[PDB]
Amino acid sequence: NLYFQGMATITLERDGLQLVGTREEPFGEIYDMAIIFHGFTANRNTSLLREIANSLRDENIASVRFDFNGHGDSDGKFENMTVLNEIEDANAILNYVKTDPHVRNIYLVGHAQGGVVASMLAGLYPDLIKKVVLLAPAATLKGDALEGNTQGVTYNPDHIPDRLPFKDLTLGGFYLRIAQQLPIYEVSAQFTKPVCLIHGTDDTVVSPNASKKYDQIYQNSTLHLIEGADHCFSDSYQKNAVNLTTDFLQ
Amino acid sequence: NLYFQGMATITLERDGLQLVGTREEPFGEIYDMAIIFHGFTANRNTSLLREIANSLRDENIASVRFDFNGHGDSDGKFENMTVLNEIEDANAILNYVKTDPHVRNIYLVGHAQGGVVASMLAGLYPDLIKKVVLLAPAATLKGDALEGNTQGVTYNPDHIPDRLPFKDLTLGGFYLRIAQQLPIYEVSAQFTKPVCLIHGTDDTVVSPNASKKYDQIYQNSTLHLIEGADHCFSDSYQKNAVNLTTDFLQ
Ligand SMILES: CCOC(=O)/C=C/c1ccc(O)c(OC)c1
Ligand SMILES: CCOC(=O)/C=C/c1ccc(O)c(OC)c1
Ligand SMILES: [Cl-]
Ligand SMILES: [Cl-]
Ligand SMILES: [Cl-]
Ligand SMILES: [Cl-]
Ligand SMILES: [N+]
Ligand SMILES: [N+]
Ligand SMILES: [N+]
Ligand SMILES: [N+]
Ligand SMILES: [N+]
Ligand SMILES: [N+]
Ligand SMILES: [N+]
Ligand SMILES: [N+]
Ligand SMILES: [N+]
Ligand SMILES: [N+]
Ligand SMILES: [N+]
Ligand SMILES: [N+]
Ligand SMILES: [N+]
Ligand SMILES: [N+]
Ligand SMILES: [N+]
Ligand SMILES: [N+]
């Protein structure tokens, strides 16, 4: 605002879970605010999401970035996380933003699974969200679940176990059952305002096809396929992903 | 079990919320178990649900019945309840039931909004649940949210407010935005094992067309129209409701 600029730690509640975020507070009385969503097994402070927030703040656009339930500093077990209770988290954060009287327009920015959270959130709030940016949005998480292969890790898609080991973590059977029947496109397509879609052509975690499908379902989308970029927009592509996002929001 | 029979109060957790229930434990080393789900604004101990759990226990079918979040003895504000978070409540209860070693077949039994919870849960666990009984399932709550008229309380369905004063209660805006888009029949229709559908013909809260519709989506359903019954299967209608429920779960 006019008196404090820079970062602050903010905590919210969603059903007796506490969610821990970082607010990037710009100069100015009135401003636009982006809610930024990290991906699966990630947290609010990846390089991509840090640089996103920072670039946004340099253009006077506020932001908040939170750890989803079961990730980062936020409460709850990873095994109990699903895309749906992430939407619930995202709604608790949308409550916080929409009641700050500094905020003018609200933007949603999500990477990977946080892109699916963003796109379905905007589809529930198409009357409130103004612009949305999706980076490598992971709608393919639904097909992976129908196939029985989530990021290497395999199961029978018709006999899903109670839990699945997944690196050093424990993934919940319910995550996968919800994943198989997520109405991603059905919900996301309710949002008819400006969408920015950024995806790397060398993404091997989430097919570019995912962004090509989002480009079909939105009537107001712009698609950027970044030649050579990976899933994380690593190395030289990160600045590319970050300027696209910033440019679009202004 | 073979040593203890009779009731107990169970406490479960879901996302930092305590869910309070009643477990009825029958005779035998091995038995089937019913999960009984109450409706919108109701609780686990309505006359109807006590009588279901009693009739079941006479057949040595075990049951549990929990207050959903925002109801009865359970945690959370009513205004923060949604059908989605009730499904998550329901999944937490299912975790408890499915991990009991005495339990053979798991049945779902849901009244009104508890019917929607039940049908959706069965659709997500079509490999685990053995049988479903829906009493006046409120699948009409979605169309009601799309029209903008929930039990006579009207609001703009394209501009859903933050909160809706709702007769001595305050229903959450996010309840309504979820309801509009819940994929009730899509998910429910994945359950291809036996379903028993029961609806009174004089229900004025949930149109009988709801049970008619399920009986069309389902690959193995049986429809019981109770001539003259009300939404809550009151007085004489209750024993008919209960017997149909009991006989079916056998
Ligand atoms: C941080 C980047 O990673 C993601 O967000 C991935 C989302 C996602 C992609 C494919 C899947 O099969 C899946 O189910 C676990 C999730
Ligand atoms: C306690 C017994 O009854 C119920 O569960 C009723 C549920 C219900 C019916 C129609 C609706 O438009 C609705 O939106 C909140 C909810
Ligand atoms: Cl699970
Ligand atoms: Cl015994
Ligand atoms: Cl009663
Ligand atoms: Cl009967
Ligand atoms: N200010
Ligand atoms: N985030
Ligand atoms: N399978
Ligand atoms: N969307
Ligand atoms: N588009
Ligand atoms: N036993
Ligand atoms: N309910
Ligand atoms: N109530
Ligand atoms: N009751
Ligand atoms: N009931
Ligand atoms: N409430
Ligand atoms: N609510
Ligand atoms: N009603
Ligand atoms: N509003
Ligand atoms: N709400
Ligand atoms: N939907």
Numbering used by the authors:
A (entry chain A), B (entry chain B): -5 to 244
From the publication, what sentences describe this entry?
The structure showed a canonical α/β fold characteristic of esterases, and the enzyme is dimeric. Two classical serine esterase motifs (GlyXSerXGly) can be recognized from the amino acid sequence, and the structure revealed that the catalytic triad of the enzyme is formed by Ser106, His225, and Asp197, while the other motif is non-functional. The structure revealed a prominent inserted α/β subdomain of 54 amino acids, from which multiple contacts to the aromatic acyl groups of the substrates are made.
The Ser106Ala-ethyl ferulate complex crystallized in two forms (Form I and Form II with a dimer and a single chain in the asymmetric units, respectively). The two ethyl ferulate crystal forms are nearly identical in structure. The root mean square deviation (RMSD) values of 244 Cα atoms of both chains of Form I onto Form II are 0.25 and 0.3 Å, respectively, and the dimer from Form II is essentially identical to the Form I dimer. In all three complexes, the substrates in the catalytic groove were oriented with the aromatic acyl moiety of the carbonyl group bound in the deepest part of the pocket. The 3-methoxy group of ethyl ferulate or ferulic acid is accommodated by a small hydrophobic cavity formed by the benzyl moieties of Phe34 and Phe160, plus the Leu165 residue. In addition, there was relatively poor density for the alkoxyl group, perhaps due to the lack of direct interaction with the catalytic pocket.
